[PDB]
């Protein structure tokens, strides 16, 4: 952050287009380290706000990633684009939504950031905000035209990610917005399926209170009760049975929830499903998002 040194070196022909091995111009370094005066001087004397390397990171990406509000508020008027995609397609509002930077996102949105912008795998900033459990961030984006019914390449909705991680307040905002409770992925998994799979019972209770299909079946015929039993969650087995879960239902693989139980030897899940199940090697896994920056 040596403003006078920057002014001298520049007056002597220093090139601000020289990128390090990582790909950072001197405006990238100022954005990373929050040097607002150096960034001010370097933008005034001609520095492309939207300069990027092989990774595609712009000075706004680094400013948002390192949470420099002043650098973002200086880059946006002069040209730092809210719509610049990284290598994985992440825009600067995807990083803001993932990291719960509410103010940086109100600035990134006031300059035209799209909340329904998609990564290479279809992930929107709403997906990242819902997955990370930022209810306030999800509400800002839902008021700037974010679609909560939009799905990624695998069909996963923000409600599906909420089910994967288990944030009740985010699911409350999503359900109040009008998000479909029983949205299905490519293979037919509902948010209730994902919540039963990952052992998030408070969200299972929430979805069942908001009219989720307890006996919903995937394309392979797996119920939210077959997932809870294949993952060993005995309390989701209970709460699902008590909310209408139907045992003796057979998937396309030919396995009922009590055998998936016995097959992986869950004594408690088998002990509870043994009482309700009458007398008579494939594992179901919901789709997941592997995106990371």
């Amino acid at each position: 952050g040596h403003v006078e040194t920057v002014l001298a070196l520049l007056e002597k022909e220093a090139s601000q287009a020289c990128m390090t091995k990582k790909g950072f111009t001197p405006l990238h370094v100022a954005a990373k380290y929050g040097k607002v005066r150096v960034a001010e001087l370097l933008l005034e004397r001609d520095a492309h706000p939207n300069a990027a390397g092989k990774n595609g990171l712009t000075p706004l990406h680094v400013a948002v990633h390192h949470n420099n509000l002043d650098i973002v508020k200086l880059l946006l008027p002069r040209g730092g684009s809210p719509h610049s995609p990284a290598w994985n397609g992440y825009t600067p509002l995807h990083i803001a939504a993932k990291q719960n930077q509410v103010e940086v996102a109100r600035s990134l949105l006031q300059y035209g950031g799209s909340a329904n912008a998609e990564s290479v795998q279809g992930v929107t900033p709403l997906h990242l905000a819902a997955q990370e459990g930022h209810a306030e961030m999800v509400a800002l984006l839902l008021s700037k035209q974010a679609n909560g019914n939009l799905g990624n390449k695998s069909g996963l909705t923000p409600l599906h990610l909420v089910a994967q991680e288990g944030h009740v307040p985010v699911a409350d905002v999503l359900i109040k917005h009008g998000v479909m409770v029983d949205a299905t992925t490519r293979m037919g998994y509902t948010p209730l399926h994902v919540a039963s799979h990952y052992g998030n019972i408070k969200l299972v209770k929430f979805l069942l209170q908001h009219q989720a299909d307890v006996n919903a079946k995937t394309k392979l015929g797996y119920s939210p009760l077959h997932q809870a039993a294949q993952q060993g969650h005995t309390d989701i087995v209970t709460l699902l049975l008590k909310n209408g879960a139907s045992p003796n239902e057979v998937s396309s693989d030919g396995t009922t929830p009590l055998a998936i139980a016995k097959r992986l030897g869950y004594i408690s899940v088998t002990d509870v499903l043994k009482v309700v199940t009458d007398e008579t090697h494939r594992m179901s896994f919901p789709e997941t998002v592997d995106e990371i920056l």
Partner: protein
Amino acid sequence: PGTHKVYVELQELVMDEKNQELRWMEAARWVQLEENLGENGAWGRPHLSHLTFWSLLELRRVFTKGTVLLDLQETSLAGVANQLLDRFIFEDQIRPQDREELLRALLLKHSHAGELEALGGVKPAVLTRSGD
């Protein structure tokens, strides 16, 4: 300067059918001759630009009281939008309460014909007091 043919592009503030989000989409482009963009995303045959009477009437009406920024020293659309909105407010063209919604809109994504297939299409839209 100029005197040589120029590239003019017209863009309309529209909604997407995928997410129903306001965005900007090219409607026409002019290299001495107009081509229009179809719903399928294919530019049509070039033609001489014919105008409607109402369009020229209202263009004269808005140009007579228009807000002009000559020799403006900005190189980005964000700075141009900020200065144009400031001058709109100064000249009592728009109210100061309209500035936030107007800048965001003006700074929304300016998509083109290549992106039209990825979206579900383009339908007309009107900006509301929020930005919905």
